[PDB]
Write an enzyme that holds these catalytic residues in place. Structure first.
Site, PDB file in Angstrom:
ATOM      1  N   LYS A 107      70.188  49.192  39.147  1.00  0.00           N
ATOM      2  CA  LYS A 107      69.583  49.801  37.970  1.00  0.00           C
ATOM      3  C   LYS A 107      70.551  50.768  37.287  1.00  0.00           C
ATOM      4  CE  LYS A 107      64.971  48.982  39.912  1.00  0.00           C
ATOM      5  NZ  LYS A 107      64.517  47.946  38.951  1.00  0.00           N
TER       6      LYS A 107
ATOM      7  N   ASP B  86      67.141  52.349  50.689  1.00  0.00           N
ATOM      8  CA  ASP B  86      67.065  51.510  49.497  1.00  0.00           C
ATOM      9  C   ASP B  86      66.889  52.467  48.334  1.00  0.00           C
ATOM     10  OD1 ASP B  86      66.220  50.023  47.275  1.00  0.00           O
ATOM     11  OD2 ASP B  86      65.156  48.549  48.469  1.00  0.00           O
TER      12      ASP B  86
ATOM     13  N   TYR C 148      59.402  47.665  49.019  1.00  0.00           N
ATOM     14  CA  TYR C 148      59.942  46.428  48.459  1.00  0.00           C
ATOM     15  C   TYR C 148      61.456  46.518  48.446  1.00  0.00           C
ATOM     16  CZ  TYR C 148      61.780  43.259  44.884  1.00  0.00           C
ATOM     17  OH  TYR C 148      62.532  42.335  44.201  1.00  0.00           O
TER      18      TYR C 148
END
Lengths: 421, 424
Positions: free
Chosen positions: B262, B234, B142
């Site tokens: 994050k 990623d 994702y």
């Protein structure tokens, strides 16, 4: 060498162009950018301790002024409970209810990270709802730099406008002239069965400030009704600023979907999309359409406080009145100096133009204005302690913190700037 | 009728499904979601004032635990200057310098509003740099729900996996099996001249936690070098969590571009992309490639992130996280074995995965899908009963924090013992 020049030099090593946001590099006005370290009310303070009356307001969010004490207190109190969770909160329910009560077209709403993500979701929903692939946007409008919007008209409906964008990603995007309803009707007459949505800034703010021409937004609503097209209003800049209920309330035209920007986060990063229940219900998890973006409690606290404060009776009338006084004073001084000059206004949104046109209506009007003179004017206004948008192609914004003292500073700076042109 | 149930019911009227983030609706575990109102350290507090040991950590950012006093103090002091006091700021220079010092592959870096926009920017830069249109991604990974990633393999390289995505937008996206280097090499041998980039989560976190197989990431680096492809890591979840220098440091493989998020906002929304100078310098304003998600580093995220990045640089930080995580997974395994419950785990630093599976190891996306997902759903709710909040999905990695210690381990293991006894 100033502190800003030193920071800009040091920033170049690990940040492309020294800036995270391209317009901040001052390429549209010349010179080296100012670095800021503090803001309060209608003012921003640069690293060399010079204070400026702000007409950018971080590009829209700071309608209450910078550092409004009720907003700051709400963020401070929320901080005690954590910066974020991975799960739903009561604040998000409060925010969704408040936004849908303030903007009637919003029957359901989703919070995302940015206006760019809000656009991606809204267009994808329109495509899912209609089963159609193509969209109409207008030249000079900005809805985020997603690949299918990085396009210009095809001489295929569209072609990429910049590198790194496959041709196939442009083929479903039509680009029409802003404020040209006949072009919209003609295009829909030709390929309307393929068009999922029209997206538009109801007041353009990313080609300077261009309000809609008489009949344009009403014509978009009617054309979309007739062709089964979803009408999307991008209110990232206009939302809660042209009027409490946004440009859609101000002009009395109801879209099917809307996007909203950082004002609903009180200045903190956030975006939203919402609109007709039947369309919104397609979004995951109850429907099959994926959302771009996956409600920060500080932004919810700041936004709830902000939206309540701007709901005070008369707020936008007061904001509009200041803005008109300012534009009137600018026009008076430009006229007295023999400088061709014209303004636009929508509530607390405005545009300044070095142009001899009677009114700014089209993208062609914007591009035909004296951009080089604006660049000089910008730097002269910096000298006078006023910070306009660093681009001839960006709207300006007022705040409720702007009062008599700020108006005097602004008009005196402009008188000197006009004299030096 | 609990406070969370009342809020969920009220949320339905104006929020689709009652939640802003689809997975937060508990559709992957059943039942209705818990609404939270406070967090501190290793704990989250729901609206009915029940405390849970937290293994979601707001999905990655809270490696210091929730509400670390030094991070909160930094945000409070920064608040004195405004929520957004404008243009470029010194804090943004400080952040860019710190990130590029901690992650040497990042010669230049940009801050944006989300990981989704970081991905969009990084892929666009790879396409611009190579002059090629296609990308390779891996099934189960994702990178954000942008249109050209909402795709599955074609039986035309890709087709849309969901409505509202034109077929044309999927045709340039190739989907290959995670951890299958031979399928990557075969694909590049056939269409490599068309492939601008390979994007990969170096540890998968969005099909539960799937660490890379030996030789996989090294093989991607060699194959990208051979074919002139940009390798994109990623690290939105792995960054600063698998190791201080991310999964790229932990596994010792250097990508051409990386995306982060994050942990670099300390809990506040932000994303970033960066990497090789020659690729990054194509981005606007000096280069011709447009950036997705422009928002000059918002100061609260920069302050929280700077403080966080410095705190996690303390010697031995990730070793301590790893050591806790190993004790926990060993204890869960022991208790599942005692109960005769097929069970296997995965770990990479402060990331972990729990699987109800008889497989010897979880290596592939098919391994994840073949596991006993319905048992995980029951396990999740039993663990809630015992005061533990796992990820509410069989397909999401779990996260440990430096605030997890002996008391939290005891709570977690005792809850699991009771949960395993109730599963059959």
């Amino acid at each position: 060498m100033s502190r800003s020049e030193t920071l800009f030099n040091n920033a170049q090593k690990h940040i492309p162009g020294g800036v995270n946001s391209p317009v901040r590099a001052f390429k549209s006005v010349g010179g080296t950018p100012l670095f800021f370290k503090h803001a309060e009310g209608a003012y921003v303070l640069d690293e060399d301790d010079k204070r400026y009356v702000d007409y950018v307001g971080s590009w829209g969010p700071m309608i209450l002024g910078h550092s409004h004490p009720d907003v700051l207190d709400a963020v401070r109190r929320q901080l005690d409970h954590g910066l974020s969770y991975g799960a739903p909160t009561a604040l998000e329910v409060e925010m969704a209810d408040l936004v849908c009560s303030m903007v009637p077209s919003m029957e359901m709403v989703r919070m995302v990270s940015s206006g760019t993500e809000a656009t991606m979701s809204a267009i994808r929903l329109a495509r899912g709802y209609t089963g159609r692939d193509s969209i109409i946007k207008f030249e000079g409008c900005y809805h985020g730099h997603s690949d299918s919007l990085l396009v210009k008209a095809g001489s295929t409906f569209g072609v990429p406008n910049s590198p790194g964008v496959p041709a196939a990603f442009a083929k479903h995007t039509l680009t029409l002239p802003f404020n040209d309803i006949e072009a919209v009707r003609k295009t829909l007459g030709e390929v309307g069965k393929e068009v999922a949505c029209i997206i538009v800034e109801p007041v353009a703010g990313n080609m300077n400030c261009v309000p809609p021409a008489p009949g344009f937004l009403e014509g978009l609503r009617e054309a979309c009704d007739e062709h089964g097209v979803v009408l999307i209003f991008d209110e990232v800049m206009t939302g809660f600023r042209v009027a409490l209920g946004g440009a859609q309330a101000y002009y009395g035209v109801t879209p099917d979907l809307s996007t909203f920007g950082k004002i609903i986060g009180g200045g903190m990063p956030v975006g939203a999309f919402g609109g007709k229940r039947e369309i919104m219900q397609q979004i995951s998890p109850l429907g099959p359409v994926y959302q771009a973006g996956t409600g920060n409690p500080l932004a919810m606290a700041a936004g709830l406080t902000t939206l309540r404060l701007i709901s005070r009776p008369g707020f936008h009338d007061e904001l509009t009145a200041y803005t008109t006084r300012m534009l009137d004073g600018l026009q008076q001084r430009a006229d007295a100096a023999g400088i061709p000059f014209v303004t636009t206004q929508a509530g607390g949104m405005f545009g300044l133009y070095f142009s001899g046109a009677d009114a700014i209506v089209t993208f062609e009007d914007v591009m035909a204005s004296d951009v080089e003179r604006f660049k000089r004017f910008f730097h002269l206004m910096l000298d006078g302690g006023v910070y306009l948008a660093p681009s001839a192609f960006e709207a300006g914004f007022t705040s409720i913190a702007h009062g008599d003292k700020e108006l005097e500073i602004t008009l005196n700076a402009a008188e000197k700037a006009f004299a030096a042109l």
